[PDB]
Amino acid sequence: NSIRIDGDITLGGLFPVHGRGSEGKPCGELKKEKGIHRLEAMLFALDRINNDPDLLPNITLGARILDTCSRDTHALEQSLTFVQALI
Amino acid sequence: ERVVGVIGASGSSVSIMVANILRLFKIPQISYASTAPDLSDNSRYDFFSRVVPSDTYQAQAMVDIVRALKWNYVSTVASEGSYGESGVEAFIQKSREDGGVCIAQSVKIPREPKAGEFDKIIRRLLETSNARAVIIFANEDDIRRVLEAARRANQTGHFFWMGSDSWGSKIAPVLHLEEVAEGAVTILPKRMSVRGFDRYFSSRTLDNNRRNIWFAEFWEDNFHCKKKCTNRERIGQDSAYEQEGKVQFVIDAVYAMGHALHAMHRDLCPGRVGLCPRMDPVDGTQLLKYIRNVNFSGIAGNPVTFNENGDAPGRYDIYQYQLRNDSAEYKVIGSWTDHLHLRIERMHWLPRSICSLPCQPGERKKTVKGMPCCWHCEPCT
Amino acid sequence: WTDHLHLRIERMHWLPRSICSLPCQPGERKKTVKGMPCCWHCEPCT
């Protein structure tokens, strides 16, 4: 799956959670140091923005993060899902 | 109204962003001029069964040509985009693997020229007078400007320009005549003049077909008018036109797509003479496999086959552009399918682009460097 | 680097030398190079 939470404003997100896989599988070993740190950074930023009354009062920001797997095809598929959801 | 298959564009850089997007919607794409090897892998663009060979065969033909021409110091010029970069990378790899034909300099043409950039290419090439022959992998737009810039440099005959796939048997890139492009080498896949296409073109006027919206400005460009021009003018004997080399490949791709559709109708649909309901939602994978499994004879009689990577078998011809004092036209000089068959006797109306002249016939020794192309003379005591 | 280099040489621990052709400090050999200003070849003339 992915990270999808409810919010007034839905922000998209692509993050290299998994590394560049070999020919056997599109997704390789998960990049815990790289992907997870950026995921938590974006989550913390969204939480701080939602909890900040000065910035967007009474407005919450949703999460629209999907895995990238450090692959162009996977990221383009995720962007296709983005544009399908938008339309 | 639904599209089962779409003919791929010519530009490899354009074709990449076309094909990756269309792979998501699972529709096969067949191209006619996109020969970049990076689209030949069946892991990044599966729906790119193209009817033309990859640029690796072009690079092999080019390295065979320079080996047969005793050329070892050849410059490389490429424009921005995937096509030129892939072509020059393949050329460098194939020359380094065998033949020992190294590259003097690698010049890059940006997508957004700033006037001063094109004349920078010519004086960057002129800084190494040893490198005479220059490999060109750009399209006609940059080729014409490069030729114009080189003409202003008063260096006629110094550079032995080599034509890529985009510089085939075409008139626009060689519109500069032989003043700066005398005897330029050219490689093009195995084309054939289409008699049916010529007959179809011979019966086309401005008002004959209304589907072609671009035909109005096509006629306006052919004859400058809106200098008012008449509607009774004929383009057959007034424009000196010549069909492009890849139009036969366009017809071949259309024929292959039609054959795949016919096979789908014969197999998946019953023996009816109409579109069965099962074929209304055409599956991308099934149609791609059927395209890959076509077997038919083309207009010129050349067989049409598709491999696992969806690339046509290697087949190329090498021509040379020069003036014979009677009529400037392209002539079939050499053939290339798996080994070179170039005709030496029909070249240059034989110069060699050697990095360094022979040191001495035993008087002095010759040494090498990181690039084994230049024989550095060293006087033994 | 803020559009002006501020490198600190005292904190460098590995001084390094990455040079194609070694220079001729005494200057007793001709400095000849190929068609690229990259290597300063020293030729010991007579």
H-helix or E-strand spanning residue A76: helix A72-86
Cα B62 → chain centroid: 12
CB-based contact A72 B20, cutoff 8 Å: yes
The response to whether B246 counts as a known ligand-binding position is yes
Residue C17, C-beta contacts closer than 8 angstroms, at least 6 positions apart: none
CB-based contact B24 A77, cutoff 8 Å: yes
A21, A72 in Cβ contact below 8 A?
no
Residue B128: CB atoms within 10 A of its CB come to 16
On chain A, the residues whose CB falls within 8 A of the CB of B44 are 72-73
A22, A28 in Cβ contact below 8 A?
yes
The response to whether B165 counts as a known ligand-binding position is yes
Question: What is the rounded CA–CA span in Å between residue B359 and residue B270?
Answer: 77
Residue C17: CB atoms within 10 A of its CB come to 5
Residue B268: CB atoms within 10 A of its CB come to 14
Tally of residues, chain C: 46
CB-based contact B44 A73, cutoff 8 Å: yes
Kindly list the distances between the CA atom of residue B230 and the CA atoms of B102, B218, B220, B226, in Å, as whole numbers in the listed order: 56, 14, 11, 10
The response to whether B95 counts as a known ligand-binding position is no
Question: What is the rounded CA–CA span in Å between residue B177 and residue B266?
Answer: 52
Amino acid at B62: M
Question: What's phi and psi for B367, nearest 5 deg?
Answer: -115, 165
Size of interface B-C (CB pairs under 8 A): 8
The distance between the two most distant Cα atoms of chain A, rounded to a whole number of Å, is 49
H-helix or E-strand spanning residue B266: helix B247-267
B192-230 residues labelled b (16+ CB within 10 A) or e (exposed): eebeeeeeeeeeeebeeeeeeeebeeebeeeeeeeeeee
Residue B182 three-state SS? coil
Q: Enter the tokens of residue B184.
A: 């330029």
The response to whether B56 counts as a known ligand-binding position is no
Residue C5, C-beta contacts closer than 8 angstroms, at least 6 positions apart: none
Question: What is the rounded CA–CA span in Å between residue A24 and residue B188?
Answer: 37
> Chains A, B in contact: 3+ Cβ pairs under 8 A?
yes
| Residues facing B102 on adjacent strands | B73
The response to whether B33 counts as a known ligand-binding position is yes
Residue B162: CB atoms within 10 A of its CB come to 26
Q: Enter the tokens of residue A20.
A: 């560049």
B359, B78 in Cβ contact below 8 A?
no
Question: What is the rounded CA–CA span in Å between residue B40 and residue B300?
Answer: 25
H-helix or E-strand spanning residue B140: helix B140-152
CB-based contact A80 B20, cutoff 8 Å: no
- Taking the C-alpha atoms of C13, C14, C18 and C22 in order, what is their torsion angle to the nearest 10 degrees? 90
Question: What is the rounded CA–CA span in Å between residue B163 and residue B181?
Answer: 11
Experimental method: cryo-EM
Q: Enter the tokens of residue B344.
A: 């030496």
Q: Which residues does A contribute to its contact with B (CB < 8 Å)? A: 23, 72-73, 76-77, 80
Question: What is the rounded CA–CA span in Å between residue B91 and residue B101?
Answer: 10
Question: What is the rounded CA–CA span in Å between residue B122 and residue B147?
Answer: 9
Residue B147: CB atoms within 10 A of its CB come to 23
DSSP secondary structure code for residue B336 in this structure = E
Kindly list the distances between the CA atom of residue B134 and the CA atoms of A8, B142, B159, C19, in Å, as whole numbers in the listed order: 59, 14, 6, 30
C: neighbours with 3+ CB pairs under 8 Å?
B
DSSP secondary structure code for residue B310 in this structure = -
How far is the alpha carbon of B372 from chain C, nearest alpha carbon, in Å? 14
How far is the alpha carbon of A24 from chain B, nearest alpha carbon, in Å? 10
| Residues facing B160 on adjacent strands | B133
B44 lies within 8 A of chain A by CB: yes
